[PDB]
Amino acid sequence: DILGFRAIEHLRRAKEIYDSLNYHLKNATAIEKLKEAVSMMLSVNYYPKSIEFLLNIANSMDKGKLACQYVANGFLENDDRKQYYDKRILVYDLVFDTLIKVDLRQKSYEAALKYNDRLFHYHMYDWLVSQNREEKLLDIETPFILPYLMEKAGKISNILWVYYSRRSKFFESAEILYRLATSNFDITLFERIEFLSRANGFCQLASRIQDACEVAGIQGDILSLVYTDARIDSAIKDELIKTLDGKILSTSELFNDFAVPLSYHEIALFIFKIADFRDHEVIMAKWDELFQSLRMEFNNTGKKEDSMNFINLLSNVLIKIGKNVQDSEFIFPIFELFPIVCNFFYETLPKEHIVSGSIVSIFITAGVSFNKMYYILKELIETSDSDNSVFNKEMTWLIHEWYKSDRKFRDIISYNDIIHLKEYKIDNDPIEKYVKNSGNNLGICFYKE
Numbered sequence: 001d002i003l004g005f006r007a008i009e010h011l012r013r014a015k016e017i018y019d020s021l022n023y024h025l026k027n028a029t030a031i032e033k034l035k036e037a038v039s040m041m042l043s044v045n046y047y048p049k050s051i052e053f054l055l056n057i058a059n060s061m062d063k064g065k066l067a068c069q070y071v072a073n074g075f076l077e078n079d080d081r082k083q084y085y086d087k088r089i090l091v092y093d094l095v096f097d098t099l100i101k102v103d104l105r106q107k108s109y110e111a112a113l114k115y116n117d118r119l120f121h122y123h124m125y126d127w128l129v130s131q132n133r134e135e136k137l138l139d140i141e142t143p144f145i146l147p148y149l150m151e152k153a154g155k156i157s158n159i160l161w162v163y164y165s166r167r168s169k170f171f172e173s174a175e176i177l178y179r180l181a182t183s184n185f186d187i188t189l190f191e192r193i194e195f196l197s198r199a200n201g202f203c204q205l206a207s208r209i210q211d212a213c214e215v216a217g218i219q220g221d222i223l224s225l226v227y228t229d230a231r232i233d234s235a236i237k238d239e240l241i242k243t244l245d246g247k248i249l250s251t252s253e254l255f256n257d258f259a260v261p262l263s264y265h266e267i268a269l270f271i272f273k274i275a276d277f278r279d280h281e282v283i284m285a286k287w288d289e290l291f292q293s294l295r296m297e298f299n300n301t302g303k304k305e306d307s308m309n310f311i312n313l314l315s316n317v318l319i320k321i322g323k324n325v326q327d328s329e330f331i332f333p334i335f336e337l338f339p340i341v342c343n344f345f346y347e348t349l350p351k352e353h354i355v356s357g358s359i360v361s362i363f364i365t366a367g368v369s370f371n372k373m374y375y376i377l378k379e380l381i382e383t384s385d386s387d388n389s390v391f392n393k394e395m396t397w398l399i400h401e402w403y404k405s406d407r408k409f410r411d412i413i414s415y416n417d418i419i420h421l422k423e424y425k426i427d428n429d430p431i432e433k434y435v436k437n438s439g440n441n442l443g444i445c446f447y448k449e
Contacts, residue, residue, distance in 0.1 A: 003030055011040045021046065028057050031090060038098065047108040051095055055115055058091040067119055092120060096127045118144050134158050138166055157187065170202035178209055181216075182248060189216060189223070189245045212248060214274050218267065219244045222254070225264055251275050265290040266321040269331060278330040287337065290317075291344045298348065307353035311345075315362045322366025334363060334376050342390050357397030369445035370402045374431070382426055395424035399431070406446045412438070 007027030014020030024041060034057070041050045062084050069080030076082075095112065102108045112124060121144040128136055137145065149166065152159050160180055167173035177199035181192040196213045203209065223244045226237050243249070249257075251271055259268035268286055277283065294317065298310045318341070325331040342359045363373055377395050381388050403409050403418050413430045421428055431442070 003027075004033055008033075008037065011037055015040050015043055017044070021049070025049075025053060028053055029060065034091070035094060038094065042098070042101065047098065047102055048111045050098065051108060051111045052115065054091055054095045054098070055112070055117060055120065058088045058095075058120070059117065061087060071119075088119065089123070092123050095120070096124070113140065113142050118147075121145070122148055129158070134162060137162055154183075157185065164198070171205075174199040174202040174209070175205060178205070178212070181212060186246060189220060192216060192245075192247075193220070211274075215248050215251065215254070218254060218271060218274070219249070221270070222258055222262075222264060222267055225262070225267070229262065231262070263289070263293065265293060266317065269321055270324050273325045273328050273331045280330070280333070280336075283330060283333075284336065287340070291340070294344075295348060300348065302350055304353055307349050311349065311353070311358060314344075315358070315365075318362050319366045322363065322368075326363075326367040334368065334373070335380070338363060338376070339380065342394070346390070356393035357401065360394040360398050361401070364398075364401070364448050367447070369447050370398070370406070371442060371445045373398065374402075378426075378429075381424070392424045396421060399424065402446065405448070408443050408446065412442075 007024065007030070010020055010023040010027055014024065021041075024037065027037075038050055038054065041053070066080050067085040067088055070082055070085045073079040099108065099112065112120070121142060125137060125140075125145070125148050128134065137149070149159060149163050153163065157180070160176060164173040164176040164180065167176065177195040180187075181195040181199070187195075193213070193216050196209060196216065199209055200213060223241065226232060226240055226244070232240070251274070255268055255271055258264065259271060265286055269290070272283060272286070294314055299306050322332070338359065341362070345354055345359055360373065360377070364370065374395075377391060377398070381391050381395065384391075399421060400418065403413070403415075412434050417430050417433075421430060426432065
C-alpha cells in the first residue's frame with residue numbers, strides 16, 4: 001500500500017530529473033498501479049530496462065513455471081491455477097503495449113528476444129502474427145522460435161510459408177511443403193504443385209514427393225479437360241473443380257469417378273502407367289476406346305482436307321499421351337500398337353490420303369528412337385505371312401528419315417546405297433547389309449530432335 005506510494009514517489013522524483021531508475025527496479029522486486037509506474041519510466045526514454053523490469057516482475061510472481069502447466073492442460077478449471085496465466089498476460093500485454101510505443105529502437109527489441117521466457121516469446125510471436133509482422137519471425141534467432149513455429153504448424157499457411165522458408169536446410173524445408181501440399185485446408189493445386197515444384201527442388205521422401213507431383217499433374221489434366229468438355233454444366237464442373245484443385249485423390253477414384261464417366265481415355269491410360277498396371281487385355285481395351293471415340297468426331301467427306309486435319313489431330317493426341325507413356329512397355333506396346341494404328345488409319349481414310357510415314361512418324365515424334373522402332377518393324381514384317389505392303393512403305397519412309405537426320409548413319413551407308421530403297425525388303429535392307437560386314441553396333445539410340 002504505502003510502499004507503493006513511495007515507489008511511485010521514487011519515480012516521481014526521477015521524472016522531475018540513473019539512481020532513481022534503480023530505486024524503481026528495486027521498488028518492483030518488493031496492476032493499473034503497475035502500468036502508471038512504467039508510463040513515467042518511459043518519459044526519460046527508459047524502454048529497454050523497462051522491459052526487463054516488466055519481465056522480471058512477470059517471473060517474480062509466478063516463481064515459477066506454474067502458468068506453463070496451466071497451458072499444458074489449457075483448461076478452464078483451476079488446472080495449474082489459471083490466475084498466474086491471466087496475470088502474466090496483462091504484464092506481457094504491457095510489454096507489447098510498450099514495445100509498440102517504440103515506433104536506438106532496436107536495443108529495446110533485442111532485450112525481449114535476448115531474454116529467457118518461453119511463454120513470453122510464444123506470446124510475443126502470437127502478438128507479431130496479429131499485426132502481421134509475420135515476416136519478422138523469419139528474422140528471429142531465439143531458442144524458442146523453432147518450437148513455436150513447429151507447434152503452431154497446423155492462415156497457418158503463413159506459419160508454414162514461414163517455416164519451409166525459415167529452414168535454410170533443405171530436407172526439413174521440403175518435408176514441410178510436402179505436408180503443405182498433402183494437407184487439409186483449401187489450397188489450390190497450382191500452389192499445391194508449386195509447393196512440390198519447390199519441395200522437389202530442395203531434394204523415401206523423394207519417392208512420396210514425385211508420386212505426388214505425378215498424381216497432381218493428372219488432376220491438372222482432367223481439370224483442363226473439364227473446361228473444354230461440353231458435356232458439363234458449369235456448376236457440375238465447379239463442384240468437380242472444387243474436388244480437383246482441393247487435393248490428391250485415390251487413383252481408382254480418379255479413374256472410376258472421372259476418366260471413365262467422362263471417357264477421358266488418355267487420362268485413364270496415363271493413370272495406368274503411374275499405377276504401374278500391366279493387364280494387356282484391359283490396357284488394349286482402353287486403347288480401343290481411344291481410337292473408337294476419335295473416329296466418332298471425324299467427318300469423312302473424301303476431301304483431302306478433313307483427311308489431313310484428322311490425320312493431324314489424331315497424330316497429335318497420340319504423340320501427347322505417347323510422350324507420357326512411351327517409356328512403359330506395357331502401357332505402350334509398340335508391337336501391338338503400331339499395327340492397330342495403321343489399321344485405324346486405312347479403316348477410316350481414303351487410301352490416297354494416307355502418305356508413307358504418317359503412322360510411324362507419330363511414334364518417332366512420341367519419343368521412340370529410330371533404333372527401337374526399326375527392329376520392331378522389321379520383326380513385324382518378317383513375322384507376318386501377309387502382304388506387308390503398308391509396313392514396307394513406312395519402313396521405307398523411316399530409313400530415309402533416319403539417314404537425313406543422323407550423320408552417324410550416313411557414315412555407314414552411302415547416299416547411293418540409300419536412293420535405291422524405294423520400298424523396303426529384308427534383302428534390300430541397307431542396315432542388314434552393313435551388319436553382315438561390320439557388326440550389329442549401330443551406336444547409341446538416335447532420337448528425333
